Amino acid sequence: GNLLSKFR
Amino acid sequence: PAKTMEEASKRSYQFWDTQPVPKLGEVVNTHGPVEPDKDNIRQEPYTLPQGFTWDALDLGDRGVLKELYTLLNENYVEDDDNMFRFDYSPEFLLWALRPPGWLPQWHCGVRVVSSRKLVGFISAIPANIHIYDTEKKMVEINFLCVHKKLRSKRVAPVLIREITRRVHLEGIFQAVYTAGVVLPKPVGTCRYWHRSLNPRKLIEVKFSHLSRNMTMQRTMKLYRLPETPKTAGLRPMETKDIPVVHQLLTRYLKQFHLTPVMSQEEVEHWFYPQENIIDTFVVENANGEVTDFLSFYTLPSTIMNHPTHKSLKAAYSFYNVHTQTPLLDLMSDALVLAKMKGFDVFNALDLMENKTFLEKLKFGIGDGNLQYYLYNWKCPSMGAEKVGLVLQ
Ligand SMILES: CC(C)(COP(=O)(O)OP(=O)(O)OC[C@H]1O[C@@H](n2cnc3c(N)ncnc32)[C@H](O)[C@@H]1OP(=O)(O)O)[C@@H](O)C(=O)NCCC(=O)NCCS
Ligand SMILES: *C(=O)CCCCCCCCCCCCC
Ligand SMILES: [Cl-]
Ligand SMILES: [Cl-]
Ligand SMILES: [Mg+2]
Secondary structure, eight states: OOOOOOBO | OOOSHHHHHTOOOTTGGGSSSOOTTOOOOOOBOSSOOOSSOOOSOOOOOTTEEEEEOOTTSHHHHHHHHHHHHHHSOBOTTSSEEEOOOHHHHHHHHOSTTOOGGGEEEEEETTTOOEEEEEEEEEEEEEETTEEEEEEEEEEEEEOGGGTTSSHHHHHHHHHHHHHHTTTOOOEEEEESSOOSOOSEEEEEEEEESSHHHHHHTTSSOOOSSSOHHHHHHHHOOOSSOOSTTEEEOOGGGHHHHHHHHHHHHTTSSEEEOOOHHHHHHHHSOBTTTEEEEEEEOTTSOEEEEEEEEEOOEEETTOTTSOOBOEEEEOOOEESSSOHHHHHHHHHHHHHHTTOSEEEEESOTTGGGTTTTTTOEEEEEEEEEEEESOBOOOOOGGGBOOOOO
16 A cells, blocks of 8 residues: 655 | 554464465475366355345446445445545446456455345456566456444455356456555565655644644645646547557566556556546657656545545555656646545555655555455565556
């Protein structure tokens, strides 16, 4: 599946 | 669940050690299958825990599509801090799960026997995949999901084995997939980057943070974009553009080492614009020739602290092909178009040539690695810039 990323 | 290769070497994989994938930390110098095509396949479904049963989801039934939407909306992938959760729409799910060649038996659900409640899912769709110097009919695996109340009970390995069996029955013995966790064994590792479009909202819901040495007023000015794109001749993709988009994409992808091989019918499916799902814009020049195109799909995320509030609207870079317009200009126009359409953030991986524009266009690095994997195909790993495949 996809990954839900946000700003480091 | 290891999210780091250093964590991963200090772990053992009771399930993945049984699968035809290379071992972690082994360097691969060959190219080919781990195990042969099977000339007889298990006819019976794998055994589920007592009280659960298999089902094949026919998404053409609106009620069943809504059940899948609800399972994913409530139990699918969250960000690392459990503040946001993917909110795939029903119409998006139809786009992602019914491409040319789809099979309903490859929409593999798990239901409670007594209530028929949907509590697990995994899907396969067919894809032709070019990997180094070989083209293989494969499947793409997506939407692996187990209800939060069913976790840590070994249901995910059963889901994986069952979709494997159902794909084997159709004569296919390789697959491609992505994951945020490190498993045996990534063929490439990619990182998401993010471009603020609505900085006020991103900071308010804590998707981003104010740099502490910068004010809000300063941040709004820094990320402000023009109101209209700058590239001459940019317009939405139309039916008449399907052949040239196909031709442009096919030639552009040859430079990478892991890519889809799309028919013209697949190009129509994956790129023809559908509001709130997929956007594609072509550059048609002064000669009437289409020379470039950009595309992004729509994937909002629930704000878990305020489920009442409107989701965070994110656009995901899909495939961007340049032959006359500089890629930097093409992606600048992608940002302006996404802003125009009301997105809060524009996401892109560091694969293909994306590293050439991410910093220049004021993207910031994200907090998660997306690993790419092949099943039953042992080949050398590659750098992100050689990965030319984007999933949903
Ligand atoms: C991912 C999910 C289905 C795993 O189910 P789970 O109950 O947490 O884990 P289980 O007890 O059922 O089984 C664990 C096995 O599955 C493996 N596994 C865990 N997550 C996996 C994933 N995303 N992809 C492939 N295998 C995975 C584990 O490595 C382990 O195998 P191992 O013994 O070799 O290490 C579940 O946590 C979930 O739905 N999470 C939210 C949605 C999600 O992240 N989907 C996948 C995105 S890539
Ligand atoms: C994200 O949802 C991807 C989850 C991937 C789970 C593992 C899939 C392994 C391959 C199964 C199909 C094999 C067919 C030959
Ligand atoms: Cl279906
Ligand atoms: Cl390797
Ligand atoms: Mg090609």
